A = this chain, B = another copy of it.
Amino acid sequence: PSQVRQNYHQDAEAAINRQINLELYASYVYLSMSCYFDRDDVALKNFAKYFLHQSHEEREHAEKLMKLQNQRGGRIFLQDIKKPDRDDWESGLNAMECALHLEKSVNQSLLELHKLATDKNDPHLCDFIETYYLSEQVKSIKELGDHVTNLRKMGAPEAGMAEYLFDKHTLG
């Protein structure tokens, strides 16, 4: 056992590794979205910038989980970062909806992680999750819901000016 490990259940370590993989996958999905919006035939620069920022934020969340794992004496066991479920995201609105679904799934994973840490009576793990990931997930999910709502009202994707003007105003 690690010299620093204390009140850090093994299955909490495994859940943290799984959450690290999930955050890396979310970063990869956001990178895919950014790439799709950097396409010449999509050409939504602010959508691409927003999703690239989300990808970097997800990578930072993963790195923070790795730092937490090392802090608690757990060992990081990296897995394959699965490819995003598709390459063509088909619209700014569809990409925002997929990002909302991804952040809701990541929030569900973090909620299960917090539940596990509570069951194992790991107050530091619970505090770390609720301080650095749960509030961030709620804020990101609310922002994505706002984006999806605005795009839907604007008439996206059918209304071609909708996505362009959302790119300029909301994301620019």
Q: Footprint of B on A, CB under 8 Å?
A: 2-4, 6-7, 24, 28, 31-32, 35-36, 38-43, 45, 52, 59, 63, 66-67, 69-73, 75-84, 87, 100, 104, 107-108, 111, 114-115, 118, 121, 123-124, 126-131, 134-135, 137-139, 141-142, 144-150, 152-155, 159-166, 168-170, 172
Chain A residues touching B, majority SS: helix
Known: A40-B149, A123-B111, A150-B43. A70 touches B134 (CB 8 A): no
Q: Which residues of B contact A71 (CB under 8 A)?
A: 40, 138-139, 142
Q: Which residues of B contact A114 (CB under 8 A)?
A: 123
Q: Which residues of B contact A134 (CB under 8 A)?
A: 123-124, 127
Closest to A146 in B: B43
